[PDB]
Design a binder for this molecule. Structure first.
Ligand SMILES: Nc1ncnc2c1ncn2[C@@H]1O[C@H](COP(=O)(O)O)[C@@H](O)[C@H]1O
Ligand SMILES: Nc1ncnc2c1ncn2[C@@H]1O[C@H](COP(=O)(O)O)[C@@H](O)[C@H]1O
Ligand SMILES: N[C@@H](Cc1ccc(B(O)O)cc1)C(=O)O
Ligand SMILES: N[C@@H](Cc1ccc(B(O)O)cc1)C(=O)O
Ligand SMILES: [Cl-]
Ligand SMILES: [Cl-]
Ligand SMILES: [Cl-]
Ligand SMILES: [Cl-]
Ligand SMILES: [Cl-]
Lengths: 309, 309
């Protein structure tokens, strides 16, 4: 595929595709994404880093924001603790094969002229738009705090200071991204990746016990977690095992089976896996066994690289 | 009078009087008030500086915050312009006989550890309490901005950084002051001065054409403005001419009158002026003439001191 195609693959939306095409013409271009530091880096995070690797392979310089100050404003704990989790996150990302510039928010988000810009932005940003932009991001709170409306302005200002042409994240970031397109002189091209379902089949993959696969999980945890996952016979939509198969597995792959149960299956693609599953030619237990074993192998270089440090 | 009494004179409230008494015991104590820089410094401002002078005479060190960054967050214009008005305000205050430390907000309100505290505060401050605290301060806006809820936290944080035992302002500051008492480790004693009615008799004295007496107004403007002021025969409540007579004039004073209109009046106090006015022994035109002429004299040292620079 060409650069545009490689970038577009497996995305949910690009705001806008015409602007992306303009950016691609440039000799130098850059892209960022932020992570509120997370004690587990799971497949949802990995999907985003895979997109950053695609951008890098399309000649973008990559900035990964370790968003320690933003995590602090979104009630993730004390800054010193969040930074220590930040350090671990950086190492995981590095273990995934990303070559990037890694920046801690607090290295610049407290500088005098950054802060002055936060306040300039605050004069332009309505409380209503700021609250609405956080509906899929703010930590639940019955008595919403001022911090909640500072957060999206800090993300916008950080996009500005990073200098990037493209900003990347999950679909839930789209309202903060629209704010950035309205508030800054240079309109950032925004690339949104799909949100991966959790193992439980109750909403997005998150740190909830048994609800995520961490990229550094042991083989026995990957098996245990996949075995327990929501995965009804025939059902592809909202089936996290099928989503894993779509976004992470390599094809062709073969699934191992005695004759009386149909015999072996050579699976040329995800689309073949889908039609086999939807037609009930392939059952949940065998699908889960395949996916776990294939995932273990896919993730092995990340585990090994981490263990070796 | 004793120190407590001198401080309490002409105040609307002291939160709390018991805490003020504790503060008075200290060998070193300090008090602040802020001003969003204002193109005119009027009698309402002068009433507050008179209270700061009382505190100073009671052995407080006085800090006057020239609140350039706060004015910026409350839509008073560009920072460079606001600072130039700030410089002029400082000179007026000095011309009133106040000896103080004058500090521009922007000298410290953009420092890294100040900013970090703003964000700590923001985590503790509800959007609802922040908006409610600004009901009598925020510039009118149909689409309220994030800046509005940053403002009261910056005032609270500035009280903290100033180190003061006492914070002073008009009654409208009381909700921001209550927030400061809840958010900071040391509870500041808060002294609220009454809000002076404008000349128009429509709400508070402000910069509105003809609505204020500036402390540096010429004699002919003071006369013209007083002559036009709302001042109905008999009516003391909401009568700005009577408020001026109460808070600024020196007693005893004599009012000049031909025999057929009652003859001269020696006025021992404001309370005598009040009973004469309420009983219609003294008419609006004569009251206005007296007040203007007495005000001109009271303000003359401020004008002279300013003109002499
Ligand atoms: N379940 C998920 N699926 C896809 N992306 C995700 C998922 N969870 C987190 N991310 C992305 O990782 C970045 C950091 O999100 P968070 O861990 O929620 O701070 C954001 O762009 C998210 O959209
Ligand atoms: N009409 C007024 N009467 C009494 N104090 C006032 C008046 N106008 C402003 N001030 C005080 O001066 C300080 C600065 O207010 P402002 O000029 O509104 O920023 C505040 O403590 C106000 O309460
Ligand atoms: N709001 C993102 C976090 C984030 C995104 C970008 C940046 B940045 O500096 O470009 C920072 C934080 C999240 O939900 O985790
Ligand atoms: N809110 C006040 C302004 C103000 C008060 C105090 C301070 B301070 O630094 O203590 C600053 C501004 C006003 O309405 O004008
Ligand atoms: Cl709000
Ligand atoms: Cl389905
Ligand atoms: Cl099967
Ligand atoms: Cl009355
Ligand atoms: Cl008379």
């Amino acid at each position: 595929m060409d650069e545009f195609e490689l970038i577009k693959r497996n995305t949910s939306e690009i705001i806008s595709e015409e602007e992306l095409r303009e950016v691609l013409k440039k000799d130098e271009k850059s892209a960022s994404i932020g992570f509120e530091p997370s004690g587990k880096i799971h497949l949802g995070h990995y999907l985003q880093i895979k997109k950053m690797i695609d951008l890098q392979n399309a000649g973008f310089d990559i900035i990964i924001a370790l968003a320690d100050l933003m995590a602090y404003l979104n009630q993730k704990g004390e800054l010193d603790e969040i930074r220590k989790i930040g350090d671990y996150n950086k190492k995981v990302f590095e273990a995934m094969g990303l070559k990037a510039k890694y920046v801690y928010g607090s290295e610049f988000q407290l500088d005098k002229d950054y802060t002055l810009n936060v306040y300039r932005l605050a004069l332009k940003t309505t409380l209503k738009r700021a609250r609405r932009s956080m509906e899929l991001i703010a930590r639940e709170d019955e008595n919403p705090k001022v911090a909640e409306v500072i957060y999206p302005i800090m993300q916008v200002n950080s996009i500005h200071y990073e200098g990037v042409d493209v900003a990347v994240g999950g679909m839930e970031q789209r309202k903060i991204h629209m704010l950035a397109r309205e508030l800054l002189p240079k309109k950032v091209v925004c690339i949104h990746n799909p949100v991966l379902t959790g193992l439980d089949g109750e909403g997005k993959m998150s740190s909830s016990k048994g609800n995520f696969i961490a990229v550094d999980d042991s083989p026995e945890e990957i098996r245990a977690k996949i075995k327990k996952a929501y995965c009804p016979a025939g059902v592809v939509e909202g089936n996290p095992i099928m989503e894993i198969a779509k976004y992470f597995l390599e094809y062709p792959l073969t699934i191992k089976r005695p004759e009386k149960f149909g015999g072996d299956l050579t699976v040329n693609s995800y689309e073949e896996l889908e039609s086999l599953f939807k037609n009930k030619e392939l059952h949940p237990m065998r699908l889960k066994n395949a996916v776990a074993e294939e995932l273990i192998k896919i993730l092995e270089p990340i585990r090994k690289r981490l263990s070796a440090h």
